[PDB]
Amino acid sequence: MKVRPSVKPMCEKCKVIRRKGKVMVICENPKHKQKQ
Amino acid sequence: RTTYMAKPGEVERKWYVIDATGVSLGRLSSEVASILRGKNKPQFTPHIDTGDFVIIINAGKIGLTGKKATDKIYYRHSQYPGGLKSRTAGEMRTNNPEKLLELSIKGMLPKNSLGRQLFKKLHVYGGSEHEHAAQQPEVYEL
Amino acid sequence: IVIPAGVTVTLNGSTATVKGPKGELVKEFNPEITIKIEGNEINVSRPTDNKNHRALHGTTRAILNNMVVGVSEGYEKKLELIGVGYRAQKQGDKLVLNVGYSHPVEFVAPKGVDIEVPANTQVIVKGYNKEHVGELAANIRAVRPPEPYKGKGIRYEGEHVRRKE
């Protein structure tokens, strides 16, 4: 998981979602997991 | 001069029973504080206690808007170093609702000797049953 | 939402009971959203176009559909053990897995779910409550999830595991 204030798609597969009022990107590529 | 002043045991203090079900914790508290203080009576005298006795029933069904159930924290400090204990309004509404309403109402009473006497006139019950039937309590609406 | 033969759907205030051949279900929905029960087909009604209602609408539809399809042909989640010395034994109501731990791992199915084991290498989870099937299936996969180096461990049958060196 990358935890950082700048969360943004790293590839085309990256999807930006919101869980519990937290922006995050989920992706097939586990390196691209990000939470804000 | 001539302005009326209530004497102790002059004004008839009545017993009221109030259903807490679905009412915001405040809103219920603020109305009850006024009844306890005697603000609803024209005999109101600031130094005497002319107010009524209040039984609150169904305190377990008291309303907490927003995320207050999880996010409203009640703190206690023992006065020992690092002796700060915390409870959520939610947990306290489940386990000790009599405590929750007493805290809420205590905060809205005068912070003095008479204020401490007023608090003694408040009886809170989690359920629908009190044991003050002898005092012939009359239902009160908010 | 079409009701198949054998199914009877009833509504009591907000809650809706569904009793069929495979089993019997009870699920409580949000009140303001209303459901119109007819002998053949089920049409769920939305009063206002507020974000809350738009969401609940699709959910009440989806869950009711799942409930009805639940009690008809039933739900089946299939699992597949990979790796040398990975096996599953069915003894009584207990699913006993040997997945490489020093101890054996055992699962007792809840009320309304079955864990019949055709071959030692694979497991199948039958039930009518899809979420109860999903959870038990996940809980069994949770014991040894698939690792990325040789693909060993408990995987879903259709699952696609990422692989490394």
């Binding site: - | 023992s78 006065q79 020992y80 170093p81 | -």
Partner: protein, 206 residues
Amino acid sequence: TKGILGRKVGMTQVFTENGELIPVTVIEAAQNVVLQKKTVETDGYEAVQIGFEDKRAILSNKPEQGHVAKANTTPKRFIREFRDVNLDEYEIGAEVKVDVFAEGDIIDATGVSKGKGFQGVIKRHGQSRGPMAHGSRYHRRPGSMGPVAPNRVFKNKLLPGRMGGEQITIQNLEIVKVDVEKNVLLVKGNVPGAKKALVQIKTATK
């Protein structure tokens, strides 16, 4: 869960069958009687009240005599409640013998520790002395009362004061021997209190 009251007689040792030598405390527990059963209906909790050692009439009063008359027994020196017991066992006036325990039973011994009177921080709280030489004028003192900022001393600054005479529970003592005709328990190791001290022996909570 079983319980009894005895007096600490003293300590000795016994050789085990193995050949090992273990220290034991001898608890004499004669004249335990069941005086009263407390129920949830009556008192709001389950407990059996046991009266221990017989006491001369003139040392009792009419309140006491009335209480033990309900159990057809003489006044009792020590009365204690046991909770977590099975009330189906215990009849009012029934003797409670040491054979409620067996060799190997793990018990918790509760008693009042020996009185040491007024004691300093070194003995009472195991604090360190200051240096004894190199110009030191600090030896058996309590240390700084605390920082400056909170113009006051915090509430657990350990200081001199009365030391022992506190209730203590030692957990998980093995019963080594049970002698019925002598009303004696042998408990491996030591239990709180001076000789003749009341000791409450009950089944280990753990």
